[PDB]
Amino acid sequence: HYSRKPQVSSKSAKAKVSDLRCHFKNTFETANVINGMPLRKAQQLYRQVLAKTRCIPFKRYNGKIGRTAQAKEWGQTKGRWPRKSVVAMLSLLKNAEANAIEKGLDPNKMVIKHVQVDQAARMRRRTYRAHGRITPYMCSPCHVQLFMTQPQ
């Protein structure tokens, strides 16, 4: 299961989505933004990044990705606005505020403590390239898991 056990089981909510069918590299970016954030400011960052009001700071999986001015917030020039990945993150954060609520915990004091998008087993599909070749297409679905303690 979780790479890191929550410090205080009763005070934290865990959530996860295995074989999430969003790009790993985009979801890798999208979930890492959240890793220290309070859940409401993380619900927010996504609602705002879903509006093209703010960007997810792509960091590791930059590549020749385009420069944006909304990335200044994050300390670098490159940034990006996944939607499929931002929605899955909200949809996994709903999962935990639900998990957090049942524990009697208060979702709006709750803080993201551990986000970890592992890359999942990949799905094959086929190209059909120039001179009779057939190279791979492969989605790179991510395993995202997280928990969110609220402070004591």
- Out of 64, 125, 129, 133, which residue is the one contacting Mg ion (CB under 5 A)? 64
SS3 assignment, position 106: coil
Give yes or no for residue 47 binding RNA (CB under 7 A).
Answer: no
Contacts with RNA in 69-88 (CB under 7 A)? 69-73, 75-78, 80-85
User: Binding site annotation covers 64?
Assistant: yes
Is residue 125 within the footprint of RNA (CB under 7 A)?
Answer: yes
Site residue total, RNA (CB under 7 A): 85
Q: Which of 26, 43, 149, 150 binds RNA (CB under 7 A)?
A: 26
> Of residues 43, 68, 149, 150, which one binds RNA by CB under 7 A?
68
Beta bridge partners of 126: 136
66 near Mg ion (CB under 5 A): yes
Measured CA distances, 131 to 8, 124, 136, 149 (Å): 59, 21, 15, 55
From residue 60, give the alpha-carbon distance in Å to each of 25, 26, 45. Answer: 9, 10, 19
Among 11, 14, 43, 107, binds RNA (CB under 7 A): 14
- 54 near RNA, rule: CB under 7 A: yes
How far does CA 28 lie from the centroid of its chain? 6
Cβ(100)–Cβ(148) below 8 Å: yes
Q: How far is the CB of 50 from RNA (least distance, A)?
A: 10
Secondary structure element (H or E) that encloses residue 141, with its range:
strand 141-149
Residues annotated within a binding site: 64
